[PDB]
Amino acid sequence: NTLAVQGRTGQRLHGPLATTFGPVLALMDNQNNSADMLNLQTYLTRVTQVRLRLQQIAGSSDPQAMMQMLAQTV
Amino acid sequence: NTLAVQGRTGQRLHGPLATTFGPVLALMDNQNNSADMLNLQTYLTRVTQVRLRLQQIAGSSDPQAMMQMLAQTV
Questions:
Q1: Which of B33, B36, B39, B74 to probe by mutation at the A interface, max A CB count within 10 Å?
Q2: Where are the alpha helices (DSSP H) in A1-74?
Q3: What's the distance, CA B15 to chain centroid?
Q4: B23 vs B29: CA distance, rounded Å
Q5: Which residues contact residue B33 at a Cβ distance below 8 angstroms, ignoring those fewer than 6 apart?
Q6: Residue B20 region, left (φ>0) first, then alpha (ψ -120 to 50), else beta?
Q7: How far is the C-alpha of A12 from the C-alpha of A25, rounded, in Å?
Q8: Mutation target vs B (from A1, A28, A29, A44; most B CBs, 10 A cutoff)
Q9: Measured between alpha carbons, how far is B54 from B64 in angstroms, rounded to an integer?
Q10: Among A14, A28, A31, B8, which is most buried by a count of CB atoms within 10 Å?
Q11: Which of A31, A39, A42 minimises the CB distance to B31?
């Protein structure tokens, strides 16, 4: 949001095409297959969803027995 | 709906972001991949769609056989 509001105050068009097509496009998702920021942001929560269950809520078996499984299947 | 209408009456913008980006966003589905409330609501109908057919309409065989083949594949 710092980049969003401090990039448009450069006058939308004459806001310079350096700091325009960079991280300003990736914030506003189009209703299509644009490489948004929300998708990497959701996949990050899925990775920390797996790992938090891996460490603490290893279900009375060791995390080691599942660590070997993950490093086998990657 | 209780949370929606009793959270908007806090004045949309000065309605506080504590009770805004929580369960008020998940109600209004966008036309995209937003994690809506409707998708957990549809999967929750599908799981009881399987189990209600499991218990009563076990088709003249026991539910125990299908319980075995269901807890096998999880």
A1: B33
A2: 2-8, 38-55, 63-73
A3: 26
A4: 12
A5: A39
A6: alpha
A7: 12
A8: A29
A9: 9
A10: B8
A11: A31
| Residue A63, CA distances (Å) to A44, A49, B30 in order | 21, 15, 39
**CA B71 to the chain's CA centroid:** 22
SS3 B16: coil
- What are the CA-CA distances from residue A74 to residues A67, A70, A71 (Å)? 11, 6, 5
For tokens 């908007």, the residue is B8
The structure was resolved experimentally with cryo-EM
Helix/strand/coil percentages in chain A, nearest 5: 50, 0, 50
> Cα(A36)–Cα(B27) distance, rounded to whole angstroms?
22
**Are A42 and B31 in contact (CB < 8 Å)?**
no
Q: What is the DSSP letter of A47?
A: H
Contact by Cβ (8 Å): A7, A15: yes
Do B35 and A29 count as a contact with CB atoms less than 8 A apart?
Answer: no
Closest chain B residue to the Cα of A32, Cα to Cα: B32
